[PDB]
Design a protein around this nucleic acid. Structure first.
Lengths: 215, 237, 28, 223, 293, 267, 49, 299, 244
RNA sequence: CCCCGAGAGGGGGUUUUUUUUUUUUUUUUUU
């Protein structure tokens, strides 16, 4: 099959199985990857879905391509062990995340430099015996933790929340918005989503600061 | 018959004797030991040579490595401020030829050479960790230079051993066998390049074919007779 | 018997993260 | 140990060789020292580009391991500090496996080591010493240690071994063990019995190689 | 009120004095006396064109002037360019030709002008004086062998551009003249580069003194006090230039002001981007020219 | 972004756009689009086609092809394929727009997938192939207009055989000449620019370069619908925005979209 | 596997002659039940360098 | 990595052509002597043209045919270049101009042409079939890679023998060669490539608008002649007097009648080459049988 | 064995044409002025091709720069909707396409005067919107037109044509149906000459028929050259009239 | 050979990394 990997025999077929509001809690850890400049572990467990993702920041490092007064940022999401997402969908979230942290990262302090942020969707279990929308706030939390752990300057602790397929990231005590995401959901439910997400944003920001300080 | 040597073998000469190390012989920077790193015939100069004996190994090779005081045939391939970019051998690291060094040199004065020209040049400086420098006129030359453009003719690829023998050994019959048939000029480079020109193309072509055949067989006896068949075939038409 | 023709193996894909993006390294 | 080799068979390469043991035939080529790519450049030492091509199909991860082990042998052999910021391309084209490639790569690796060494010699590249590699195997019913085993012997083996030693002083002094690749079930006593018999057959191989090298290269040189 | 204009079409991908003309490969002449110039090639007596255009005969020099092609630098042209890259002791600037033009560190007027001693430091620190993306006036000082241009800004007339907006038209619509910087009604000034690059800015004191501080000749800062009318004037002037270009008619200082006052019929400025207004405007410019004869 | 501008040009443009009476470089109003040209039904080999040309030379070509599939195994009945000339297939911009567009035209989100059903087992799979020849800004709205035009001039093959596989199970056979027009309601995608406190419809290239932020708002059935995405039009001047701006943008689209659709739904 | 899956052989025709592709049985894994892997624990080695 | 060619060498080789001289001493219409050596195993063939050295290896394994073609087996041809043939070649460069051309010439000469009977590679329809693979190894380059490969592939396919297979139901029984002899492949025709190299002794103007044609064409160019040519033509024929494929992908514009002359000249070469291949295959068969008789006798 | 009348006894083909007639050949110059220096939209039969010439301009990488000539690049984009049956996979890296791109480059390297544009790059982008036989010949005509529109110097026209051979009979300008039913020959002819820039035969052709097929193609290609030249002078003349 | 001072001063002639392979409609012989 592939000359760079061992994928086994081609006649083999994958094993297929047959048949015979809620509060959210998360766990935070930073700086456990010596390979890079900043890293974070974000684990969340709620209802019938738990998520364990890892973020890793590499930078500021050298940029071959062009001169720059300010810094350049790249974000890449990788599929984890079991749960899988479309490459398109991971690219879309990456673009959405780039826009957010281009409003938070003090790029002026890193001329001709590159800050490459990796987020590994290591373990995403779906226990219900576009799901990507519920993972977005946890990504922003991981990237924010990793950047702060790396020592990259941030204007403010960027956090987010999710409510009925709507994701919105806040800064400045929730006064302003650094990103807005909406899939599916209902009609004229903007005000309700903003309030619910700001509550999650506030809770995540407190736990993040608590993690960056005490730990 | 010769006394062949292989890398990792014991060096015959004793440390009590002052020895100038040539090609093939390596002096370890860490253990200070002198050891052979090439495979071939060991040559040691006789004693009495100003109290210094020169030892080296004659080994087979075709990839040239620039050394100071070598006559080489390069091809202009580039333009750089303050010099020409010249290539001694394909895929090898380029060498530099300054605009300053030329037969009637002037800082104001400039060379007329155009990329693609063959240059008979001497390598004055060859630092190991730095680009090779080639000069048409040499201080060693002391006002006499054979250096410069080669016009037309044909160039021939040849292993370093065959080229070295053609340049330094007078007992090599190749030049003589080619002189008993026709008269032409030849430039010889230690980088394994041989430039041949005659008045007519058929003669230059005949010389080209002979040098390659003789380089291939490496049987000193063959060429005078081998040359004879080559000259004949051209007139075959 | 104990000949190698009677034994199977697993097919592993090992990925090492070092902050780069591109083809599989020689290490992996 | 009735191997057969030829030197200087390729025209557009600085050095080449063709090593044959049994049914295992490998042809190797070496170009260098030459201009390296920027990503290959080493400020002080020589950069090695090592390529292994299989007898059937295209190069896979299998050959990537053959390239890696061959690198471990050739790297300390070459006096790399003689060629700073320079490149040496080393290509091995395995022409005939001489073994079940779906199970073993023993004989192909040893033959590649011997061929690469010969090609380096032909190319005239600075070497710190000499080298020889042999494949070894063990059989459970027999309990024997067979040097240079056949393909049929490998099928009924309990362990397979690649041994490559570094020789100096006219091929009499083992400077070091460049590579020992032992795979399968074996004990400590078997290992040293292997190393003792392996060193003997390796030393015999160097002597044979030294003969081949002198027989081919001497006609090129002058007296 | 109209939200948008959409023009539709079905079943089709797209809508659908004598001057000598010739195509590549066509035989132009068989007189070997001729000196073959650009756009041509020859074999013995036969001269063939090397491009699609009109045959030109100046004295004994036969050449074929192409219909189409990029801006070709001539020595002494007044061009407007953008810094593409900065290396060594030179600035490489995008003019709009086949190659980037060069701008050596020597040519430009350094801060403090004549009085300041020549400095080793400046070559290292040049980006601060100029950098990637900056616009500037420049004159084609010399030409390289291939045809590339060497620029210079050794004048107060030339230098970094500010206090305005950039727009470009095909270089064929702008020809050489005695001067390419012009003052227009509305207190704005146009810089019509021969390369087709145009700069519209608020009229400065220099622009007035042309027909009637040396430390800040490379400052990015726009004038702090720029009125809306000056801004709304720039928008109006720029649209009309695009309108003239849309008609494939070469720009004139007179044509511009004429169009600017004629466009006053339309209340909203954003009404100068539409094709109908441009088509009607183009005809207006041309009929007047015909009357002038 | 695409266009390269100096710091001075950007400062002038920003101040001009961030002004309380927002001044556009071309003199437009904060809701005025630039003139476009649309060609349709020029690819006879396909079921539907469109070609949109912008005023800045931006050009996009959309093709519509159909295929009979088993809707029990084929979940997605409408696949959007985006190809931007000069960009790799795995480029960030390409995949993002591809992922976005597929969500805009999902089977059960912004498209009446009932009109694609043939029988109780088989339905029409619609392949929307996008080819962006040239573009100087975010082409998401450009592509959207072309897809709309193409889907409104698409003609599919007509079924002949019975529509009950479960029992009789007849092989899907179609008429030799007659084709039924695809009646469907394609959604539109509008893109906005945020400069200071002003919101602009149809951002130009130079405008997007100095913008603080941007919005991607979908539109279907006379109302705002998902996907709704905030987007950085450039990456050097991206700033956070007040929530009222987000509500202003949604309101702005909600009142000017029917005007666009009206000019786009012309007979 | 299903006791008697309706899906049987698939007939493919050549240029005059006929052939039948053998019936492919869809193997299904049990949602719950499982057996442990039979590893030769005597052979499990551990790594060190 | 570039090959530097001096002006002197360029002018000399071209002027020699103007005097009916080529460096190797061959004739403009002279094809190099092709030497074919078979290894111990079937499908192992070594082709040599002067200094040019190529090696081909034919292999096969049990595989399943495509859904579209349930009666046809699988057949692929690999021609990956390596620095062994020269440092001019990048390792694994399978997208370069010359590489893709060569790859496409061979494919259109053997694969597309149906030189191999892929229908006879089927064991059980739509289930199991043979997958024949032709691996070409470019050892030493002195020009004529396309011609050397086409001969290497064809000689290999005609020399190769696959092990007998008996099939019952699902089960496959691969008989070893010793128990029963292996079975040869089915060859519908024998395609042979002949490559022509073109040289413009004058300038472009006299090529485009020049009255009398003067372009030089030589058969089977060496590396030096290959690096200085202005156009290439590869024509493939067989003993049945038919053109398998012709490929003049751009290059120096050439007279149509001259290209036709080349096709007729190539036909005389492919005839000699085909008969040559067949003879070397017979002798190889006679050699293996004579040893089989001397092995059974003593046994 | 074809059950359709590829060439009826009445000398008529499936589309109505005879043996010797070109298919509607409609050219179009300056179609994409804001996207390229030169552009052409080709309609040869049902074939629809957009051709863009971008250059001569600065190379994006100084590593890839020739100081003696311009770098000529050609990328052919055969869209997934070019043929009745939509192709699932892309053709961007398809070997068949790489050969086509390479072929086109090797054709115009000896026609376009790259020597007078040193230290520059000429990028040729092609988009095939619809395909119906003889796509190679149409690709040649599209590049020649677009290059001329860009004002890039070249020695002469290069006209492309395809000729099929059904039994004895030779069919000019074949479509997809005819190509599927017989072997075809693709010919590139320089100017009005008899010299071929491109000779392409991918299927079996008797050696005796090849010369006659070439003769038909060259004659047909000359007509393509005339149509290209005609439409070009027409576009030129109007521009001259309006500009002057 | 090229640009700036009127006379042997000065300034320029352009080097290096990123992402896998398919491909169109009842035997035998003469009759």
């Amino acid at each position: 099959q592939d000359r760079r990997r061992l994928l086994g025999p081609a006649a083999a077929k994958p094993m297929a199985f047959s048949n015979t509001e809620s509060e959210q809690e998360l766990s935070l850890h930073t700086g456990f990857i010596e390979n890079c400049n900043g890293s974070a572990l974000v684990e969340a467990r709620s209802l019938g879905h738990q998520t364990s993702l890892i973020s890793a920041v590499y930078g500021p490092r050298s940029i071959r391509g062009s001169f720059t007064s300010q810094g350049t940022i790249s974000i890449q999401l990788k599929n984890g062990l079991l749960e899988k997402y479309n490459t398109n969908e991971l690219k879309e979230v990456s673009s959405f995340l780039m826009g957010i942290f281009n409003s938070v990262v003090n790029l002026s302090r890193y001329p001709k430099s590159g800050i490459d942020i990796f987020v590994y969707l290591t373990y995403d279990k779906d226990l219900t015996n576009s799901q990507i929308s519920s993972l977005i706030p946890h990504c922003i939390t991981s990237i924010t933790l990793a950047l702060a752990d790396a020592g990259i300057e941030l204007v403010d602790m960027a956090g987010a929340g999710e409510a009925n397929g709507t994701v919105v990231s806040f800064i400045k005590n929730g006064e302003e918005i650094v990103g807005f995401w909406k899939d599916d959901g209902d009609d004229e439910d903007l005000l309700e989503c903003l309030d619910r997400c700001k509550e999650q944003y506030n809770r995540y920001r407190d736990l993040m600061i608590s993690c960056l300080m005490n730990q | 018959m010769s006394t062949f040597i292989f890398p990792g073998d014991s060096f015959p000469v004793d440390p009590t004797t002052p020895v100038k190390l040539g090609p093939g012989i390596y002096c370890d920077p860490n253990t200070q030991e002198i050891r052979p790193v090439n495979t071939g015939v060991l040559h040691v100069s006789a004693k009495g040579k100003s109290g210094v004996q020169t030892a080296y190994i004659d080994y087979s090779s075709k990839r040239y490595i620039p050394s100071v005081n070598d006559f080489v045939i390069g091809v202009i391939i580039g333009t750089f401020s303050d010099s020409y970019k010249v290539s001694l051998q394909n895929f090898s690291s380029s060498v530099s030829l300054s605009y300053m060094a030329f037969p009637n040199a002037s800082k104001k004065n400039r060379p007329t050479l155009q990329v693609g020209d063959l240059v008979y040049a001497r390598v004055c400086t060859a630092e190991k960790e730095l680009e090779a420098e080639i000069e048409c006129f040499d201080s060693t030359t002391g006002r006499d230079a054979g250096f410069g453009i080669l016009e037309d003719g044909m160039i021939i690829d040849v292993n370093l051993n065959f080229a070295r023998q053609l340049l330094f050994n007078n007992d090599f019959p190749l030049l003589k066998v080619l002189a008993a048939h026709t008269k032409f000029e030849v430039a010889i480079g230690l980088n394994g390049k041989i430039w041949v020109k005659c008045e007519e193309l058929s003669n230059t072509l005949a010389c080209y074919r002979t040098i390659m055949e003789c380089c291939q067989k490496n049987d000193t006896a063959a060429f005078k007779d081998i040359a004879k068949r080559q000259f004949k075939e051209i007139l075959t038409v | 018997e104990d000949i190698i023709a009677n034994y199977a193996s697993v097919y592993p894909v090992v990925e090492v993260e070092r902050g780069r993006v591109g083809a599989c390294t020689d290490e992996e | 140990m009735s191997v057969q080799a030829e030197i200087g068979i390729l025209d557009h390469v600085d050095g080449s060789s063709e090593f044959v043991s049994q049914d295992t035939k490998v042809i190797c080529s070496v170009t260098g020292p030459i201009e390296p790519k920027a990503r290959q450049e080493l400020p002080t030492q020589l950069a090695l580009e090592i390529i292994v091509r299989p007898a059937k199909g295209v190069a896979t991860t299998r050959e990537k391991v053959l390239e890696d082990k061959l690198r471990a042998v050739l790297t300390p052999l070459i006096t790399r500090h003689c060629y700073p910021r320079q490149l040496c391309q080393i290509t091995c084209q395995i022409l005939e496996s001489g073994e079940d490639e779906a199970e073993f790569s023993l004989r192909e690796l040893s033959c590649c080591i011997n061929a690469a060494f010969l090609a380096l010699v032909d190319a005239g590249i600075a070497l710190n010493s000499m080298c020889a590699s042999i494949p070894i195997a063990i059989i459970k019913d027999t309990s024997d240690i067979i040097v240079d085993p056949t393909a049929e012997q490998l099928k009924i083996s309990l362990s397979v071994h690649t041994l490559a030693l570094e020789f100096v002083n006219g091929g009499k002094v083992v400077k070091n063990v460049l590579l020992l690749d032992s795979n399968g079930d074996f004990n400590e006593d078997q290992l040293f019995s292997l190393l003792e018999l392996g060193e003997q057959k390796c030393q015999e191989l160097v002597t044979n190689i030294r003969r081949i090298i002198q027989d081919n290269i001497s006609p090129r040189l002058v007296v | 009120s109209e939200v948008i204009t959409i023009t539709k079409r079905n079943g089709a991908f797209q809508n659908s004095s004598d001057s000598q003309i010739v195509t590549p490969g066509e035989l132009v002449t068989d007189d070997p006396i001729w000196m073959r110039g650009h756009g041509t090639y020859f074999l013995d007596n036969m001269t063939y064109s090397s491009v699609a255009g009109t045959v030109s005969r100046v004295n004994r020099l036969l050449s074929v002037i192409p219909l189409k092609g990029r801006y070709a630098p001539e020595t002494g042209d007044h061009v407007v360019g953008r810094i593409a890259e900065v290396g060594n002791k030179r600035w490489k600037v995008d003019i709009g030709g086949k190659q980037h033009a060069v701008l050596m560190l020597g040519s430009v007027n350094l801060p403090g002008g004549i009085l300041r001693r020549k400095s080793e430091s400046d070559e290292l620190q040049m980006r601060s004086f100029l950098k990637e993306g900056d616009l500037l006036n420049a004159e084609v000082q010399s030409l390289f062998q291939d045809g590339s241009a060497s620029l210079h800004t050794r004048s107060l007339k030339y230098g970094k551009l500010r206090n305005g907006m950039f727009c470009q038209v095909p270089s064929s619509l702008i020809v050489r003249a005695k001067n390419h910087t012009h003052n227009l009604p509305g207190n704005i000034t146009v810089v019509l580069g021969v390369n087709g690059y145009i700069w519209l800015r608020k009229t400065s004191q220099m622009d007035l003194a042309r027909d009637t501080s040396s430390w800040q000749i490379y400052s990015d800062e726009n004038d702090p006090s720029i009125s809306n009318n000056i801004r709304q004037a720039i928008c109006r002037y720029a649209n009309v230039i695009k309108a003239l270009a849309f008609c494939e008619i070469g720009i004139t200082q007179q044509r511009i002001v004429s169009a600017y006052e004629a466009s006053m019929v339309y209340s909203n400025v954003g009404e100068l981007i539409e094709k109908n207004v441009m088509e009607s405007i183009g005809s207006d410019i041309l009929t007047a020219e015909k009357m002038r004869g | 972004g695409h266009m390269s501008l100096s710091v001075a040009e950007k400062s002038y443009l920003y101040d001009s756009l961030a002004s309380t009476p927002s001044i556009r470089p071309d003199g437009r109003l904060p809701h005025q689009f630039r003139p476009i040209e649309i060609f349709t039904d020029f690819l006879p080999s396909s079921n539907g086609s469109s070609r949109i040309i912008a005023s800045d030379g931006s050009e996009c070509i959309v093709s519509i092809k159909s295929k009979v599939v088993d809707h029990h195994v084929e979940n997605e009945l409408l696949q959007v394929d985006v190809d931007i000339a000069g960009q790799r297939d795995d480029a960030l911009v390409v995949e993002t727009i591809t992922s976005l567009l597929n969500k805009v035209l999902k089977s059960g989100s912004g498209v009446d997938s009932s009109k694609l059903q043939l029988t109780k087992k088989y339905s029409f799979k619609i392949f929307v192939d996008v080819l962006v020849i040239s573009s100087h800004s975010h082409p998401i709205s450009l592509i959207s207009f072309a897809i709309y035009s193409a889907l409104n001039s698409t003609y599919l093959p007509k079924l002949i055989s019975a529509f009950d596989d479960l029992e009789v199970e007849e092989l899907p056979t179609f008429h030799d000449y007659d084709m039924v027009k695809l009646d469907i309601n394609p959604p539109l995608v509008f893109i906005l620019a945020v400069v200071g406190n002003n919101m602009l419809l149809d951002p130009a290239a130079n405008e997007s370069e100095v913008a603080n932020n941007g919005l991607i708002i979908s539109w279907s059935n006379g109302k705002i619908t998902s996907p709704i995405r905030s987007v950085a039009l450039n990456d050097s001047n991206v700033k956070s925005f007040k929530p009222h701006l987000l509500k202003q943008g949604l309101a702005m689209v909600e009142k000017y979209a029917p005007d666009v659709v009206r000019s786009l739904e012309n007979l | 596997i299903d006791e008697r899956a309706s899906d049987l052989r698939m007939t493919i025709r050549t240029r005059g002659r006929s052939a039948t592709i053998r019936e492919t049985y869809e193997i299904i894994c049990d949602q719950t039940k499982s057996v442990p892997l039979m590893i030769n624990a005597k052979n499990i080695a551990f790594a060190s360098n | 990595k570039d090959i530097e060619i001096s002006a002197s060498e360029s002018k000399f080789i071209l002027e020699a052509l103007r005097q009916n001289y080529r460096l190797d001493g061959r004739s403009f219409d002279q094809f190099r002597d092709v030497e074919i050596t078979f290894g111990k195993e079937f499908g192992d063939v070594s082709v040599k043209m002067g200094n040019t050295k190529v090696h081909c290896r034919i292999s096969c394994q049990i595989a399943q045919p495509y859904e579209d073609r349930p009666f046809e087996g699988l057949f692929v041809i690999s021609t990956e270049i390596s620095p062994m043939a020269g440092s001019q070649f990048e390792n694994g460069n399978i997208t370069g101009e010359d590489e893709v051309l060569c790859s496409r010439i061979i494919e259109k000469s053997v694969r597309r042409s149906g030189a191999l009977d892929v229908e006879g590679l089927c064991i059980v329809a739509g289930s199991k079939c043979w997958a024949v693979r032709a691996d070409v190894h470019f050892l030493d380059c002195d020009g004529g890679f396309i011609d050397a490969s086409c001969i290497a592939v064809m000689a290999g396919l005609m020399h190769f023998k696959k092990p007998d297979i008996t099939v019952h139901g699902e089960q496959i029984i691969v008989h070893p060669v010793n128990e029963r002899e292996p079975v040869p492949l089915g060859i519908l025709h024998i395609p042979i490539c002949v490559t022509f190299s073109f040289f413009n002794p004058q300038d472009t103007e006299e090529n485009i608008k020049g009255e009398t044609n003067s372009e030089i064409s030589i058969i089977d160019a060496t590396l030096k002649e290959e690096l200085l040519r202005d156009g290439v033509l590869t024509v493939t024929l067989n003993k049945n007097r038919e053109v398998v494929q012709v490929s003049k992908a751009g290059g120096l514009p050439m007279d149509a009648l001259t290209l036709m002359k080349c096709c007729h000249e190539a036909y005389s070469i492919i005839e000699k080459i085909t008969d040559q291949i067949l003879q070397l295959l017979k002798e190889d068969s006679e050699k293996r049988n004579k040893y089989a008789a001397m092995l059974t006798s003593e046994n | 064995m074809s059950r359709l009348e590829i060439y009826s006894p009445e000398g008529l083909r499936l589309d109505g044409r005879r043996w010797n007639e070109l298919r509607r050949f409609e050219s179009s110059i300056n179609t994409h002025p804001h996207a390229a220096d030169g552009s052409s939209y080709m309609e040869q039969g049902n074939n629809k091709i957009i051709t863009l010439v971008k250059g001569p301009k600065e190379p994006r990488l100084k590593s890839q720069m020739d100081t003696s000539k311009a770098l000529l690049n050609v990328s052919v984009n055969i869209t997934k909707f070019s043929k009745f049956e939509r192709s699932k996979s892309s053709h961007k890296n398809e070997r068949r396409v790489l050969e086509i791109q390479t072929s086109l480059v090797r054709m115009f390297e000896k026609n376009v005067m790259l020597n007078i544009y040193p230290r520059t790059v000429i990028d040729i982008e092609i988009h095939v919107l619809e395909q119906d036989g003889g796509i190679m010949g149409s690709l040649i005509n599209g590049i020649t037109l677009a290059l001329i529109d860009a004002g890039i110097s070249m020695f002469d026209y290069i006209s492309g044509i395809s000729v099929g051979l059904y039994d004895t009979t030779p069919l000019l300008d074949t479509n997809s149906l005819e190509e599927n039913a017989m072997s075809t020959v693709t010919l590139g002819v320089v100017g009005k000459s008899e010299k071929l820039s491109l000779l392409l035969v991918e299927d079996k052709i008797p050696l005796d028929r090849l010369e006659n097929v070439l003769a038909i193609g060259i004659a047909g290609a000359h007509r393509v050259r005339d149509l290209m030249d005609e439409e070009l002078r027409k576009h030129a003349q109007k521009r001259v009239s309006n500009a002057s």
